[PDB]
């Protein structure tokens, strides 16, 4: 009776950290046996290195469970892909640490893909919140042409048309254009003047300026910032009155990893105590036989909910994606990140501290306006 | 030189939420866990949990979850244990002891005085 | 979990007459076990880790045997200091016996 679980880690400092979390869990008193051998290996930059190194270390070493936590230089994307597809073959399920990707929401792709961190996506249910207590009635999407911004216009589509409302029209950007001067022209014209933004750092750049060229963000404009728009070059670019979101603690990989370890050995202890089970296959060259215990593993990992968690309840959807998460609304004064608001999870509970809006002033605008110009 | 300071007896009230600290000196608070172990009179020792100041896991037993709270400050190497509900039943002698970090092989290898809590009307 | 039971429950010799102490586990624990020594009055003191070694500075009087569910205390020589209450606990069960203490024959 010996459960294994791997471990891609960005930093050894970390990896020896995490172990040793990992061996203070083993102290458990319920805890008997092997439960959690812990496994280590660092990002390699090569994807079919890394690849190779997991087949012949994690999967070799019966490994029931993989931890992927952020890679050690956030500038590059370096998305856990290729450790997933390998994961999704044999069905050995993972935990995504600080995946924040909205590509892995969709089970088709990757077949046994968890994670911790709501994605990009899930900023859509902040937003209707916000929309619901400061009363957005007519909304405007400026998402790019992506597969993250896809899923967020569908989600906030989906979330939308509950109150029978829909937005007045949604462009689409491409990744990487920068000629964007006529799709802000064309939504100059428009009755609503409350923005939703939902791109990249460049692209979230290019659209600050042509919006600060093109003179829209004057007072009664009212910007939606996602945490991914702010951080980076946004910083020196996006105007006053910025309405951004935080994950509170989201780059934070140790608390990620102390919250994972914890469920993780629930989990495997559930699935040990359920009934009879299939080990995993000792070689990963040969074998096109699929885990039998891992959809099993699967169900128990959604059906887990615990409150022991640094970051609160953890808790997984059918999606793999985690439930009543907590954000910060983030208000931008004199170019500095102010901490305005909370979310607890369908509820936004504003802070003692003002909110500033684009254009100077302080008093909170109205949304949607006319214009007395009718064609 | 390893030595373990805890609370002086104290007496309480059914009902009631008693504390008792432990404070840690010549070894790293941090690297070795702190296990809260009680001993009625005329019993053996009974296990409450552990805690360990380099994470702050805290582990309860069943039995005892829900009243038994355990916090650790690192500034000054000192554990608390919180217990509340107190019954006729708790009066017993509570000991703090150490454990290392990794290794399974050394149980409590020092043990503190003990403190004494009495539950009466 | 796992229950620790203690035999005999009281045990009387003289000085210096071997002192047994049998102590079995409700099911197999390898060899995680653990004696401890307690004086009424004072802390207990961890005499044999993982019953097989004796802890730094225990008297070599001490000895333990046994394996799987059934662990044996043998004293060579009782002492005056030696009539305490022994406990048996297992590592991940931290479960403790019921304790079986040495008092003088009268």
């Known amino acids: 009776k010996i459960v294994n679980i791997g471990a891609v880690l960005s930093t050894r400092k970390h990896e020896q950290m995490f172990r040793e979390a990992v061996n203070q869990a083993n102290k458990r008193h319920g805890s008997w046996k092997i439960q959690l051998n812990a496994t280590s290996v660092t990002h390699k930059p090569n994807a079919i290195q890394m690849a190779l190194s997991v087949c012949e270390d994690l999967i070799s070493s019966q490994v029931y469970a993989i931890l992927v936590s952020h890679p050690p230089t956030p500038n590059d994307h370096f998305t856990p892909t290729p450790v997933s597809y390998t994961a999704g073959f044999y069905r050995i399920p993972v935990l995504g640490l600080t995946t924040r990707m909205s590509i892995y929401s969709d089970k088709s792709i990757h077949l046994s893909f968890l994670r911790t961190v709501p994605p990009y996506s899930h900023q859509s249910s902040v937003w209707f919140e916000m929309m619901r207590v400061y009363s957005w009635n007519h909304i405007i999407l400026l998402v790019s042409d992506d597969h993250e911004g896809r899923a967020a216009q569908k989600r906030l589509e989906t979330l939308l048309e509950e109150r029978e409302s829909k937005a007045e029209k949604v462009l689409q950007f491409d990744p990487g254009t920068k000629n964007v001067t006529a799709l802000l022209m064309e939504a100059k014209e428009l009755e609503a003047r409350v923005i939703i933004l939902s791109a990249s750092e460049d692209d979230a750049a290019t659209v600050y300026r042509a919006a600060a060229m093109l003179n829209m963000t004057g007072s009664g404009y009212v910007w939606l910032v996602g945490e991914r728009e702010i951080s980076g070059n946004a910083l020196r670019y996006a105007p006053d009155g910025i309405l951004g979101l935080q994950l509170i603690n989201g780059k934070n990989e140790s608390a990620h990893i102390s919250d994972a370890v914890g469920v993780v050995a629930q989990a495997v202890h559930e699935l040990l105590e359920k009934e009879n089970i299939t080990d995993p296959p000792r070689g990963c060259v040969g074998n096109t036989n699929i885990w039998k215990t891992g959809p099993l593993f699967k169900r128990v990992l959604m059906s887990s909910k615990y409150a022991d968690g640094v970051t609160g309840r953890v808790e997984f959807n059918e999606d793999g994606d985690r439930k009543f998460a907590n954000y910060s609304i983030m208000n931008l004064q004199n170019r500095k990140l102010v901490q305005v608001g909370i979310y607890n999870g369908t509820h936004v509970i504003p802070n003692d501290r003002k909110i500033i809006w684009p254009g100077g002033e302080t008093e909170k605008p109205r949304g949607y306006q006319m214009s007395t110009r009718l064609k | 030189q390893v030595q373990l300071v805890q609370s002086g007896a104290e007496v309480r009230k059914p009902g009631a939420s008693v504390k008792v600290s432990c404070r840690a000196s010549g070894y790293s608070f941090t690297g070795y866990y702190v296990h809260w172990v009680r001993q009625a009179p005329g019993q053996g020792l009974e296990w409450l949990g552990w805690?360990?100041?380099?994470?702050?896991?805290?582990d309860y037993s069943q039995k005892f979850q829900g009243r038994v709270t355990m916090t650790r400050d690192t500034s000054i190497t000192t554990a608390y244990v919180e217990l509340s509900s107190l019954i006729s039943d708790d009066t017993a002698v509570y000991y703090c002891?150490?454990?290392?970090?990794?290794?399974?092989?050394?149980?409590?290898?020092?043990w503190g005085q003990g403190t004494l809590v009495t539950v009466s009307s | 979990d796992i229950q620790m039971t203690q035999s005999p429950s009281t045990l009387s010799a003289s000085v210096g007459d071997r002192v047994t102490i049998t102590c079995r586990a409700s099911?197999?624990?390898?060899?995680?076990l653990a004696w401890y020594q307690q004086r009424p009055g004072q802390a207990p003191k961890l005499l044999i880790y993982?019953?097989?070694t004796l802890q730094t500075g225990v008297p070599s009087r001490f000895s333990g045997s046994g394996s799987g569910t059934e662990f044996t205390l043998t004293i060579s020589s009782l002492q005056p200091d030696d009539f305490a209450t022994y406990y048996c606990?297992?590592?991940?069960?931290?479960?403790f016996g019921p304790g079986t203490k040495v008092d003088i024959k009268r």
């Open positions: 993982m019953a097989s």
């Open positions: 805690i360990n100041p380099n994470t702050g896991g805290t």
């Open positions: 099911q197999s624990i390898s060899s995680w």
């Open positions: 606990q297992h590592y991940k069960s931290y479960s």
């Open positions: 002891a150490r454990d290392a970090t990794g290794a399974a092989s050394s149980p409590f290898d020092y």
